[PDB]
C-alpha cells in the first residue's frame, strides 16, 4: 500500500527533495503533514496550496500571525502535529534543537522515523535510543544510508568494521601550515540559498565526519574502535562494511540525495527510478587515502566524546557551533575551530552523566557554548 | 555438527586452498573424500596423511596403481566417490569436461555443490539446473561469490543489472593488430590471479569472462542483456549489483580465493579470518573502463551462445578448449581462438535443442571439438 508521511522541515533542502520523491511516487507515498520554522512561511503556504495538505505546523508564532488558518502554531507546533497525526513515516528534517522533541514524539507514536536531524542522535543520544525500538529509526544521510544497505551483506555478528567515506573537504592534503591561512570564503562561506553556512564548513573541518561517526555508533551499535574513516574525493562510494571473513561490501552512486531520501521513506523497499546509477561506459577511478589525523583530529575527538558518553557528544557539537560561527565572523582562524572543541571537551567531564530529560541536554549545550565563547574571546 | 566436505580436484590451486580453509576451521568443516587426476601424487600422499582421508579417487589408472589402497580409480572414479560418500558439501574443482558427471552425481545426492568447475554448468545448462534444488549450487568463483553477496542488498524484483568485473588481461588496451603476434608466453602471465596455462589464457582472451556471463545467467536467472561486464585492472571489486533505485552494491577484497571458497563451503555463514580485508589505512584506486568489444568479442559471443540456449553454451566452451589447445601448442595465432569459437557457433544450428540427458551434452561437445579441429585445419 501507500505510506502516510509527515514532513517536518518541509521548506529546507531535505524536506523539498523528499516532497519531490513523494510527488514522483504517488503509488508509494502520501503527505499527511507539513511542519516548517516560519522564515519560509510563503513556501509552506505554497506547499499547502500544491499538496492540498491543510495539516500544517509553523513554529514561529509571529510568522503564524500572517495567516489565520494554521492548525498548529507556536514553539511546540511540530511536536503537537506529530502527536495528533496518523502516519506511517515521520521525516524529521528540522534543524538543530527543535528537531529533538518531535523525534521523541514520533518514536512514541510508533511511526517509522526517517531521521535527518543530527541533533536528535548527537545531542539527544541515550534519550532517543531508549525511546526507539529496533529498526524504528531509518537514517536519511548518504553515509548512514550506505551503511544500512551494506549491513544486509551479513548478520550483525559478522560485522568487523564500519568504514565511512569522507570527501576530505577543500583542504584535503593540506598541511597544518596551509590551514593557518584558510579564509571563511575558502572554507565555503557563500550566501548559498537552501542550506545554512555550517554544513560546508563542517565538511572542511572534518567535524561533519566526527558527527557522522557518533551517529553511526548510535544507529548501528558498533564500537567507536570499529568505526573507521577513509578519504574518497569522488564521493561515489558512500560507505562500506567489512565483514569477519575479510569481505567488504560497498554502496556506490553518483552524488544525489534523492537516493538515500527515497530509501529512508520507503525502507526496506527501494523506490524505482529514484536516482541515476553508476555508468561504466565511461572510464573512471575511485580513489581512497587515509585521513591525516595530526592535521584533522576532529574525528578522533568525536570518538573521544562518544566513548565518554552521556552528554559529551552534545558538548562536542555545541562547542563546534560556537567556534565555527566565530571563524566565519573572523574572530578566530580555521585551525582554532577544532582546537576550541578539544579545549572545551577536555574541560567537560561533568557532562559524562546520562541525561534524564531534554533540559539535561540543553544544560550541557548551554555550558559548552559559554565555555567555547570564553575560549574564543580569552575571557 | 561440522560439515562433511568432499574435495574434487584436491591437488589443484582451489583444492589446496580449500583444504587450508578446512584445516583452519575443524569446528565448521571436515574432509571426507579427495579426488585427483594423478598428475601430482606428491601432493595427494601429503593430503592423505594430513587429513587421514583414505577415501580417495584417482583418475589415471597407472597413477592409482603407483599409489595403492585407492578405493576408486579410472575415468569414473570421482563420480563413484561422490555417489558412495556421505557428505554435506561437494567441492567440484575438477578441470574442464571431467567435472560434468561428478556435478550431476553431486546434485543427485542432495549435498551442496560448491562449484569451481564452471564448464559443468556452462555445458550442462538446463540439464544441470533441473537436477539442482534452489540454492544447492553455490559458486566458488570470485565474481559469482561477489554477486551472491551483493544480491543481499535488495529483493529479486529490485535488481536492475549485474555487473561483472574483468581484469582485462595482459592485452588490455592492445589493438587487433597487436594481438596477431601474441605468444603462449605473453598470454601466460595474469596481473592479479596466479593460475595454470588454461585459466590464464582464458582471462587473456576474455573467454573466461564470457563463460562467467553464462554461469551468471544460469546461477541467478538474470537476462543476458542485464548482465554487464566492466574492465577493472585491480581486481579488487569482484562484482556489483545495480538496483532499480540507482544504488549499486559492490563486493571488494584483495584477490585471494580462500574468501569465496570459505563462503561457498559454509553458505550462508561467513568464515572468520578466511582472508585479508581491504586496508583503508593506505592509499589505493579502483579503476573502471569499458571493455573494447571490437578487439575482444568473446563476451558478446557468450551472450549470443547463451541466448540461443540448449547445448549452444556447451558448444561455446568445447570450441574454446580445442582452439586454446591449438594456440598453446603453437598451431594457431591468438586472435584465431575467438575466431574459431565464432566460426563453430555459426555452424552450430542443431545445438539449440535443450539437453535431455548427459549424452545430448556430450554429443554437442563432440561435434564442437570436431568442427573446431576442422577450423584449425583450415588455417
Ligand atoms: Mn554526509
Ligand atoms: Mn573468476
XYZ file of C-alpha atoms and ligand atoms in Angstrom:
760
model
C 0.000 0.000 0.000
C 0.780 3.712 0.410
C 2.876 5.118 3.236
C 1.413 8.143 5.049
C 4.260 10.665 5.518
C 4.677 13.670 7.812
C 7.370 16.021 6.505
C 8.995 18.015 9.339
C 11.198 20.815 7.962
C 9.345 20.949 4.664
C 10.994 24.136 3.319
C 14.638 23.030 3.644
C 16.782 21.036 1.198
C 15.910 17.536 2.526
C 12.205 18.322 3.015
C 11.714 19.734 -0.514
C 13.602 16.880 -2.162
C 11.531 14.375 -0.146
C 8.381 16.166 -1.377
C 9.642 15.678 -4.957
C 10.252 11.977 -4.348
C 6.732 11.765 -2.900
C 5.291 13.723 -5.889
C 7.013 11.348 -8.314
C 5.712 8.265 -6.445
C 2.020 8.717 -5.505
C 1.651 4.900 -5.679
C 4.105 4.672 -2.762
C 3.665 7.743 -0.567
C 1.199 10.378 0.546
C 1.867 13.583 2.525
C -0.417 13.925 5.556
C 1.501 16.656 7.410
C 3.957 19.524 6.903
C 5.939 21.476 9.523
C 8.240 24.480 8.990
C 10.009 27.158 11.032
C 8.363 30.372 9.807
C 11.253 32.012 7.926
C 9.919 30.388 4.758
C 6.225 30.758 5.530
C 5.461 31.626 1.909
C 6.969 28.329 0.661
C 4.915 26.405 3.260
C 1.750 28.236 2.173
C 2.560 27.345 -1.450
C 3.147 23.733 -0.349
C -0.267 23.750 1.335
C -1.739 25.096 -1.933
C 0.037 22.489 -4.113
C -0.498 19.369 -1.984
C -3.939 20.185 -0.600
C -2.382 19.301 2.761
C -4.031 21.538 5.395
C -2.446 19.705 8.335
C 0.443 22.167 8.789
C 2.641 23.474 11.605
C 4.534 26.761 11.934
C 6.937 27.054 14.905
C 7.199 30.850 14.804
C 4.066 32.312 16.411
C 4.951 35.748 14.987
C 5.113 34.309 11.422
C 1.897 32.389 12.124
C 0.214 35.814 12.714
C 0.346 36.438 8.938
C -2.136 33.595 8.407
C -5.479 32.940 10.116
C -5.836 29.203 9.483
C -2.769 27.264 10.757
C -3.914 24.331 12.976
C -0.539 24.191 14.778
C 1.461 27.304 15.671
C 3.968 28.255 18.378
C 7.029 26.642 19.974
C 5.700 23.054 20.231
C 3.751 23.120 16.937
C 5.770 20.378 15.169
C 5.535 18.131 18.270
C 1.749 18.595 18.516
C 1.297 17.832 14.794
C 3.245 14.589 15.171
C 1.248 13.708 18.322
C -2.070 14.264 16.584
C -1.405 12.966 13.035
C -1.886 9.337 11.945
C 1.163 8.447 9.879
C 3.415 5.538 8.949
C 6.595 7.630 8.494
C 7.797 10.846 10.083
C 10.595 12.514 8.131
C 12.437 14.641 10.646
C 14.394 17.203 8.604
C 14.178 20.007 11.191
C 17.441 21.810 12.004
C 19.126 21.805 15.401
C 17.425 21.866 18.794
C 13.876 21.995 17.507
C 14.318 18.542 15.959
C 14.742 16.783 19.309
C 11.226 16.876 20.855
C 9.462 15.942 17.558
C 11.843 12.957 17.262
C 10.785 11.767 20.745
C 7.097 12.380 19.960
C 7.472 10.487 16.652
C 9.094 7.490 18.365
C 6.164 7.401 20.830
C 3.520 7.238 18.029
C 5.276 4.084 16.816
C 5.778 5.524 13.342
C 8.989 4.813 11.475
C 11.342 7.799 11.892
C 13.280 8.775 8.786
C 15.869 10.863 10.594
C 17.884 13.687 9.003
C 18.080 15.934 12.103
C 21.562 15.354 13.583
C 20.779 16.989 16.932
C 18.472 14.041 17.744
C 21.300 11.497 17.899
C 24.345 13.689 18.540
C 22.762 15.668 21.379
C 19.725 13.585 22.337
C 21.836 10.405 22.488
C 20.572 7.937 25.087
C 17.251 9.813 25.452
C 16.476 8.983 21.838
C 17.974 5.455 21.871
C 15.976 4.450 24.956
C 12.777 5.691 23.312
C 13.335 3.986 19.946
C 12.604 0.381 19.170
C 14.844 -1.734 16.925
C 14.678 -0.567 13.303
C 12.331 2.323 14.051
C 14.949 4.904 13.076
C 15.965 4.963 9.415
C 18.796 7.389 8.591
C 18.440 9.871 5.761
C 22.056 10.943 5.186
C 24.125 9.268 2.423
C 26.850 7.626 4.609
C 24.392 6.054 7.098
C 22.072 5.003 4.316
C 25.067 3.328 2.613
C 25.891 1.512 5.886
C 22.266 0.291 6.353
C 22.402 -1.194 2.827
C 25.861 -2.731 3.230
C 24.880 -4.342 6.573
C 22.491 -6.538 4.571
C 25.629 -8.387 3.418
C 25.746 -10.440 6.649
C 24.386 -10.864 10.173
C 25.159 -8.310 12.944
C 27.600 -10.864 14.457
C 29.569 -10.943 11.144
C 30.488 -7.230 11.156
C 34.139 -6.393 11.722
C 34.341 -2.701 10.701
C 32.189 0.163 9.503
C 34.073 2.431 7.128
C 32.678 5.867 6.400
C 33.959 7.692 3.348
C 34.810 11.396 3.608
C 35.304 13.817 0.710
C 38.281 15.302 2.571
C 36.817 18.793 2.017
C 38.505 21.705 0.157
C 41.678 21.293 2.290
C 42.278 17.623 1.595
C 46.031 17.046 1.642
C 46.738 20.484 3.165
C 49.496 20.813 5.769
C 48.931 22.344 9.213
C 50.833 25.412 7.888
C 48.427 25.650 4.930
C 45.423 25.586 7.278
C 46.656 28.699 9.136
C 45.778 30.792 6.070
C 42.231 29.447 5.486
C 39.609 32.203 4.975
C 35.830 31.791 5.549
C 35.216 32.039 1.779
C 37.757 29.285 1.022
C 36.033 27.177 3.703
C 32.705 27.618 1.897
C 31.345 30.910 3.203
C 28.893 31.754 0.420
C 25.330 33.119 0.900
C 24.047 29.912 -0.741
C 20.258 29.698 -0.913
C 18.842 26.419 0.530
C 21.485 25.311 3.066
C 22.960 27.099 6.100
C 26.683 28.074 6.160
C 27.647 25.436 8.746
C 27.391 22.346 6.551
C 30.183 23.175 4.066
C 32.403 24.417 6.931
C 31.767 21.210 8.918
C 32.841 19.261 5.836
C 36.113 21.279 5.544
C 36.939 20.930 9.266
C 36.117 17.193 9.314
C 33.671 17.922 12.164
C 30.821 16.670 9.940
C 32.553 13.309 9.746
C 33.001 13.220 13.532
C 29.258 13.861 13.890
C 28.577 11.078 11.368
C 30.836 8.672 13.288
C 28.918 9.423 16.529
C 25.586 8.927 14.712
C 26.942 5.645 13.236
C 27.733 4.290 16.719
C 24.234 5.158 17.946
C 22.452 3.922 14.792
C 24.222 0.592 14.336
C 25.600 -0.368 17.781
C 29.185 -0.746 16.603
C 32.051 0.302 18.912
C 33.908 3.530 18.077
C 37.117 1.490 17.700
C 35.411 -0.413 14.829
C 34.283 2.754 13.035
C 36.824 3.963 10.535
C 37.037 6.872 8.124
C 38.640 6.903 4.684
C 39.066 9.897 2.388
C 37.430 9.320 -1.010
C 37.456 12.521 -3.108
C 34.892 11.347 -5.730
C 32.094 10.701 -3.152
C 30.850 7.819 -5.318
C 31.289 5.137 -2.665
C 29.163 6.429 0.195
C 30.410 3.981 2.879
C 31.392 0.322 3.355
C 31.129 -2.628 5.730
C 33.996 -5.061 6.315
C 32.861 -8.484 7.497
C 34.737 -11.042 9.687
C 35.835 -13.193 6.676
C 37.632 -10.238 5.008
C 34.871 -9.396 2.535
C 33.933 -5.713 2.162
C 30.539 -4.575 0.866
C 30.320 -1.016 -0.511
C 27.432 1.158 -1.672
C 28.108 3.334 -4.759
C 26.139 6.008 -6.661
C 26.673 9.394 -8.311
C 26.009 12.053 -5.624
C 22.205 12.647 -5.403
C 20.422 12.895 -2.024
C 17.133 11.670 -3.535
C 18.551 8.132 -3.417
C 19.061 7.977 0.372
C 15.917 10.070 0.988
C 13.754 7.719 -1.141
C 15.120 4.637 0.618
C 14.600 6.187 4.050
C 10.984 6.929 3.116
C 10.331 3.522 1.517
C 12.520 1.420 3.861
C 13.064 -1.501 3.488
C 11.676 -1.179 -0.064
C 13.695 0.594 -2.778
C 11.997 3.272 -4.883
C 12.298 2.631 -8.621
C 13.929 5.477 -10.574
C 14.983 7.499 -7.508
C 18.392 8.394 -8.869
C 20.788 7.617 -11.700
C 23.046 4.580 -11.281
C 26.832 4.495 -11.786
C 27.651 4.419 -15.508
C 30.528 2.204 -16.539
C 30.541 3.178 -20.252
C 32.972 5.964 -19.390
C 36.269 5.298 -17.619
C 36.625 6.415 -14.003
C 38.622 5.830 -10.861
C 37.586 5.595 -7.225
C 40.442 6.793 -5.003
C 40.991 6.120 -1.307
C 43.528 7.687 1.047
C 43.914 7.864 4.833
C 42.845 10.932 6.759
C 45.755 12.864 8.178
C 44.662 12.789 11.821
C 47.503 15.039 13.025
C 46.166 17.799 10.761
C 42.474 16.836 11.088
C 41.829 15.450 14.647
C 38.027 16.218 14.581
C 37.033 12.573 14.065
C 39.415 11.322 16.826
C 37.861 13.966 19.104
C 34.341 12.809 18.164
C 35.297 9.254 19.160
C 36.667 10.577 22.472
C 33.372 12.406 23.107
C 31.298 9.369 22.077
C 33.321 6.947 24.198
C 32.951 9.273 27.227
C 29.175 9.074 26.631
C 26.336 10.872 28.417
C 26.041 14.453 27.189
C 29.638 14.644 25.902
C 28.658 14.460 22.220
C 26.227 17.353 22.820
C 29.214 19.255 24.255
C 31.341 18.420 21.154
C 28.667 19.662 18.768
C 27.735 22.831 20.686
C 31.421 23.767 21.048
C 31.726 23.311 17.271
C 28.684 25.505 16.549
C 30.185 28.332 18.591
C 33.767 28.008 17.313
C 32.705 27.623 13.661
C 30.444 30.684 13.848
C 33.420 32.562 15.371
C 35.675 31.551 12.459
C 33.025 32.698 9.938
C 32.905 36.029 11.824
C 36.695 36.463 11.676
C 37.134 36.109 15.453
C 39.407 33.066 15.156
C 41.422 31.273 12.479
C 40.405 27.957 10.903
C 42.692 25.638 12.949
C 41.205 27.063 16.194
C 37.782 25.528 15.482
C 38.894 22.026 16.396
C 41.385 23.493 18.886
C 38.464 25.063 20.767
C 36.337 21.907 20.503
C 39.209 19.963 22.126
C 39.701 22.512 24.917
C 36.000 22.632 25.804
C 35.667 18.831 25.635
C 38.670 18.218 27.918
C 37.058 20.531 30.486
C 33.660 18.841 30.244
C 33.749 15.592 32.287
C 30.786 16.651 34.472
C 28.643 16.121 31.342
C 29.507 12.408 31.015
C 26.357 11.563 33.049
C 23.407 10.219 31.042
C 20.646 12.805 30.578
C 17.233 12.102 32.149
C 15.417 14.900 30.297
C 15.708 17.287 27.339
C 16.586 20.012 29.883
C 19.690 17.985 30.827
C 20.862 18.023 27.189
C 20.033 21.747 26.897
C 22.110 22.452 30.027
C 25.208 20.670 28.641
C 24.856 22.623 25.382
C 24.472 25.903 27.320
C 27.647 25.113 29.264
C 29.596 24.140 26.109
C 28.566 27.313 24.207
C 29.625 29.615 27.061
C 32.865 27.654 27.508
C 33.571 27.989 23.748
C 32.765 31.729 23.835
C 35.357 32.219 26.608
C 37.978 30.263 24.640
C 37.209 32.483 21.613
C 37.402 35.832 23.457
C 40.102 34.980 26.030
C 37.706 35.727 28.906
C 27.854 -30.593 13.872
C 30.539 -29.746 11.307
C 30.039 -30.049 7.539
C 31.392 -33.117 5.722
C 33.213 -31.971 2.591
C 34.288 -33.947 -0.460
C 37.020 -32.109 -2.413
C 37.264 -32.965 -6.120
C 40.440 -31.785 -7.861
C 42.161 -31.582 -4.473
C 45.724 -31.103 -5.813
C 44.987 -28.049 -7.946
C 45.016 -24.483 -6.626
C 41.383 -24.347 -5.465
C 41.551 -27.809 -3.890
C 44.627 -26.959 -1.797
C 43.287 -23.592 -0.626
C 40.006 -25.376 0.211
C 41.995 -27.845 2.322
C 43.690 -24.906 4.096
C 40.281 -23.349 4.922
C 39.039 -26.707 6.287
C 42.244 -27.336 8.299
C 41.950 -23.794 9.754
C 38.293 -24.436 10.658
C 37.877 -28.011 12.046
C 34.956 -26.642 14.079
C 32.994 -25.957 10.868
C 34.392 -28.442 8.328
C 35.797 -31.966 7.865
C 37.226 -33.569 4.682
C 35.611 -36.964 3.978
C 36.873 -37.543 0.404
C 39.524 -36.488 -2.084
C 39.669 -36.875 -5.844
C 42.615 -36.060 -8.090
C 43.819 -36.689 -11.634
C 47.064 -38.437 -10.614
C 49.488 -35.892 -12.095
C 50.602 -34.597 -8.669
C 50.996 -37.679 -6.451
C 53.422 -35.906 -4.109
C 50.613 -33.553 -3.038
C 47.991 -36.301 -2.863
C 50.045 -38.511 -0.483
C 50.722 -35.481 1.702
C 46.994 -34.709 1.708
C 46.059 -38.288 2.588
C 48.497 -38.162 5.542
C 47.373 -34.781 6.962
C 43.613 -35.297 6.598
C 43.557 -39.007 7.498
C 41.336 -39.478 4.452
C 41.890 -42.726 2.562
C 38.560 -42.350 0.772
C 40.323 -41.249 -2.427
C 39.605 -41.260 -6.171
C 42.443 -41.231 -8.717
C 41.557 -40.796 -12.421
C 44.742 -42.127 -14.069
C 44.800 -45.945 -13.530
C 48.604 -46.024 -13.776
C 48.916 -43.272 -11.143
C 46.405 -45.107 -8.920
C 48.465 -48.315 -9.136
C 51.632 -46.355 -8.235
C 49.864 -45.084 -5.096
C 47.955 -48.063 -3.593
C 44.866 -48.831 -1.475
C 42.956 -46.408 -3.730
C 39.263 -47.384 -3.464
C 38.287 -45.556 -6.712
C 40.343 -45.484 -9.902
C 39.640 -44.875 -13.590
C 37.824 -42.156 -15.549
C 34.650 -42.611 -13.461
C 36.438 -42.643 -10.054
C 35.431 -39.113 -8.988
C 31.762 -39.736 -9.911
C 31.711 -43.043 -7.968
C 33.429 -41.427 -4.943
C 30.615 -38.806 -4.927
C 27.864 -41.458 -5.211
C 29.334 -43.566 -2.401
C 30.416 -40.894 0.118
C 28.077 -39.484 2.748
C 28.661 -35.710 2.683
C 27.133 -32.261 3.209
C 29.174 -30.384 0.583
C 30.791 -31.416 -2.658
C 33.538 -29.050 -3.805
C 33.985 -29.599 -7.559
C 37.295 -28.082 -8.624
C 37.930 -30.568 -11.416
C 39.179 -29.240 -14.765
C 37.145 -28.998 -17.976
C 34.895 -31.827 -19.190
C 35.902 -34.042 -16.242
C 33.639 -32.054 -13.913
C 30.248 -32.710 -15.517
C 29.363 -36.230 -14.347
C 30.606 -35.558 -10.790
C 28.461 -32.368 -10.775
C 25.394 -34.408 -11.738
C 26.268 -37.154 -9.225
C 26.712 -34.490 -6.505
C 23.349 -32.856 -7.207
C 21.600 -36.264 -7.088
C 22.986 -36.858 -3.545
C 21.339 -33.657 -2.314
C 24.584 -32.216 -0.931
C 25.558 -28.603 -1.579
C 27.634 -28.281 -4.744
C 30.369 -25.714 -4.215
C 31.135 -25.254 -7.881
C 34.576 -24.245 -9.117
C 34.240 -26.267 -12.335
C 32.404 -23.704 -14.467
C 32.481 -25.947 -17.505
C 29.939 -28.333 -15.956
C 27.378 -25.549 -15.533
C 28.197 -23.860 -18.863
C 27.975 -27.157 -20.771
C 25.351 -28.795 -18.543
C 22.998 -25.813 -18.887
C 19.374 -26.743 -18.165
C 20.259 -30.411 -17.548
C 22.351 -29.379 -14.516
C 19.717 -26.837 -13.399
C 16.840 -29.397 -13.387
C 18.953 -31.656 -11.145
C 19.542 -28.888 -8.577
C 17.306 -27.697 -5.754
C 17.120 -23.891 -5.212
C 20.420 -22.786 -3.659
C 22.072 -26.212 -3.966
C 24.705 -24.802 -6.337
C 26.959 -22.292 -4.542
C 29.624 -20.708 -6.793
C 33.305 -20.708 -5.781
C 34.331 -18.219 -8.499
C 35.223 -14.752 -7.147
C 32.718 -12.911 -9.431
C 29.682 -15.047 -8.655
C 30.513 -15.133 -4.958
C 30.584 -11.317 -5.027
C 27.257 -11.251 -6.897
C 25.593 -13.546 -4.384
C 26.713 -11.280 -1.507
C 25.669 -8.100 -3.380
C 22.211 -9.534 -4.140
C 21.535 -9.445 -0.380
C 21.320 -5.652 -0.956
C 17.696 -5.976 -2.125
C 14.838 -8.253 -3.217
C 14.975 -10.070 -6.620
C 12.411 -7.630 -8.128
C 14.751 -4.726 -7.229
C 17.663 -5.974 -9.387
C 18.356 -3.855 -12.484
C 21.794 -5.073 -13.594
C 24.546 -7.487 -12.610
C 27.978 -6.040 -13.247
C 30.867 -8.442 -13.653
C 34.371 -7.090 -13.363
C 37.158 -8.313 -15.633
C 40.920 -7.712 -15.167
C 41.164 -7.001 -18.894
C 44.120 -9.431 -19.018
C 47.692 -8.730 -20.271
C 46.417 -7.302 -23.543
C 44.057 -4.689 -22.111
C 44.332 -1.665 -24.397
C 46.022 -3.532 -27.276
C 44.836 -3.287 -30.878
C 43.561 -6.106 -33.080
C 46.862 -5.724 -34.986
C 48.847 -6.101 -31.743
C 47.100 -9.389 -30.819
C 48.302 -11.157 -34.008
C 51.844 -11.614 -32.671
C 50.929 -12.749 -29.137
C 52.900 -15.789 -27.926
C 51.789 -18.503 -25.448
C 54.399 -16.905 -23.138
C 52.805 -13.440 -23.271
C 49.354 -14.979 -22.718
C 50.813 -16.930 -19.770
C 51.036 -14.225 -17.078
C 47.981 -12.783 -15.275
C 48.249 -9.411 -13.399
C 46.215 -10.388 -10.301
C 45.289 -14.098 -10.394
C 48.097 -16.686 -10.388
C 46.840 -19.807 -12.224
C 47.618 -22.575 -14.766
C 48.016 -22.126 -18.582
C 44.335 -22.767 -19.449
C 42.681 -20.421 -16.889
C 45.350 -17.783 -17.588
C 44.840 -17.989 -21.362
C 41.060 -17.651 -20.919
C 41.489 -14.443 -18.873
C 43.772 -13.115 -21.643
C 41.255 -13.965 -24.406
C 38.230 -12.798 -22.343
C 36.658 -16.235 -22.791
C 36.755 -16.797 -19.041
C 34.584 -13.659 -18.707
C 32.190 -14.965 -21.399
C 31.936 -18.275 -19.517
C 31.255 -16.271 -16.333
C 28.475 -14.299 -18.052
C 26.808 -17.636 -18.963
C 27.300 -19.013 -15.418
C 25.801 -15.759 -14.066
C 22.698 -16.179 -16.234
C 22.269 -19.832 -15.198
C 23.036 -19.290 -11.460
C 20.997 -16.106 -10.939
C 18.449 -16.245 -13.777
C 19.102 -12.673 -14.968
C 18.700 -11.946 -18.731
C 21.892 -11.640 -20.779
C 21.085 -8.010 -21.647
C 21.082 -7.150 -17.894
C 24.482 -8.805 -17.313
C 27.196 -6.229 -17.874
C 30.981 -6.518 -17.964
C 33.320 -3.686 -16.884
C 37.121 -3.797 -17.036
C 38.715 -3.231 -13.597
C 42.519 -3.772 -13.759
C 42.986 -4.031 -9.969
C 40.595 -6.981 -9.481
C 39.670 -5.628 -6.033
C 35.986 -5.089 -6.821
C 34.905 -8.649 -7.741
C 31.437 -7.715 -8.998
C 28.490 -5.382 -8.367
C 24.703 -5.306 -8.444
C 22.770 -2.217 -9.570
C 19.268 -1.882 -8.108
C 16.185 -0.141 -9.582
C 16.615 2.988 -7.382
C 20.083 3.745 -8.763
C 22.036 2.188 -5.901
C 24.952 -0.114 -6.665
C 26.206 -2.629 -4.102
C 29.737 -3.929 -4.691
C 31.998 -6.557 -3.068
C 35.709 -5.829 -2.637
C 38.701 -7.728 -1.289
C 42.402 -8.213 -2.061
C 42.499 -11.109 -4.548
C 42.541 -14.344 -2.532
C 40.380 -17.347 -3.417
C 40.114 -18.562 0.200
C 37.400 -15.919 0.737
C 34.918 -17.173 -1.949
C 35.979 -20.789 -1.205
C 35.171 -20.363 2.502
C 31.804 -18.734 1.745
C 30.895 -21.434 -0.756
C 31.635 -24.186 1.779
C 29.766 -22.684 4.710
C 26.996 -20.760 2.887
C 25.226 -18.709 4.147
C 27.611 -18.332 7.128
C 30.793 -16.299 6.865
C 34.081 -17.932 7.952
C 36.077 -15.795 10.374
C 39.601 -14.930 9.207
C 39.274 -16.568 5.772
C 41.138 -13.739 4.036
C 42.718 -10.319 4.493
C 40.343 -7.377 4.217
C 40.909 -4.273 2.138
C 43.157 -1.948 4.093
C 41.812 1.623 4.079
C 44.730 2.993 6.093
C 46.730 3.010 2.860
C 46.027 4.765 -0.433
C 44.588 2.910 -3.415
C 42.490 3.475 -6.503
C 39.917 1.308 -8.176
C 39.814 1.951 -11.896
C 36.961 1.128 -14.252
C 36.957 1.212 -18.057
C 34.694 -0.148 -20.801
C 35.663 -3.405 -22.464
C 36.859 -2.965 -26.039
C 34.289 -5.279 -27.647
C 35.839 -4.783 -31.108
C 39.162 -6.349 -30.102
C 37.501 -8.627 -27.511
C 34.195 -10.120 -28.757
C 34.360 -13.264 -26.567
C 31.782 -11.866 -24.110
C 29.255 -10.926 -26.830
C 29.787 -14.366 -28.385
C 28.994 -15.855 -24.970
C 25.759 -13.824 -24.780
C 24.805 -14.961 -28.303
C 25.537 -18.608 -27.388
C 23.662 -18.188 -24.101
C 20.604 -16.627 -25.736
C 20.451 -19.471 -28.296
C 20.483 -21.792 -25.270
C 20.155 -25.581 -25.198
C 23.538 -27.126 -25.975
C 24.995 -23.957 -27.533
C 26.939 -22.931 -24.427
C 28.446 -26.456 -24.375
C 29.467 -25.691 -27.993
C 30.980 -22.337 -26.989
C 33.014 -23.949 -24.197
C 34.138 -27.015 -26.193
C 35.223 -24.899 -29.168
C 37.298 -22.765 -26.809
C 39.115 -25.780 -25.315
C 40.141 -27.040 -28.758
C 41.220 -23.639 -30.134
C 43.032 -22.860 -26.842
C 44.995 -26.136 -27.042
C 45.990 -25.414 -30.648
C 47.205 -21.958 -29.578
C 49.298 -23.267 -26.687
C 50.792 -25.990 -28.921
C 51.854 -23.250 -31.393
C 49.460 -24.278 -34.192
C 47.330 -21.108 -34.396
C 47.700 -17.420 -33.514
C 45.958 -15.721 -30.564
C 43.120 -13.918 -32.484
C 42.209 -17.293 -34.019
C 40.998 -18.649 -30.664
C 37.895 -16.436 -30.570
C 37.684 -16.510 -34.380
C 37.329 -20.301 -34.240
C 34.685 -20.097 -31.477
C 32.698 -17.699 -33.748
C 33.092 -19.967 -36.800
C 31.973 -23.034 -34.817
C 28.946 -21.267 -33.237
C 27.907 -20.002 -36.700
C 27.788 -23.630 -37.883
C 26.070 -24.995 -34.743
C 22.400 -24.722 -35.886
C 21.188 -28.030 -34.414
C 22.623 -27.457 -30.920
C 19.912 -25.067 -29.667
C 17.789 -28.059 -28.605
C 17.648 -28.464 -24.800
C 19.659 -31.401 -23.389
C 17.509 -34.237 -22.007
C 20.452 -36.400 -20.941
C 24.208 -36.075 -20.380
C 24.598 -37.824 -23.769
C 22.991 -34.832 -25.534
C 25.589 -32.548 -23.878
C 28.412 -34.934 -24.786
C 27.122 -35.165 -28.414
C 27.201 -31.343 -28.668
C 30.776 -31.113 -27.342
C 31.941 -33.989 -29.572
C 30.579 -32.160 -32.620
C 32.111 -28.836 -31.438
C 35.550 -30.380 -30.896
C 35.489 -31.817 -34.432
C 34.234 -28.562 -36.012
C 36.895 -26.622 -34.076
C 39.546 -29.043 -35.442
C 38.213 -28.543 -38.981
C 38.590 -24.764 -38.431
C 42.199 -25.253 -37.273
C 42.996 -27.461 -40.325
C 41.718 -24.580 -42.480
C 44.444 -22.236 -41.201
Mn 27.016 13.059 4.852
Mn 36.604 -15.583 -11.989
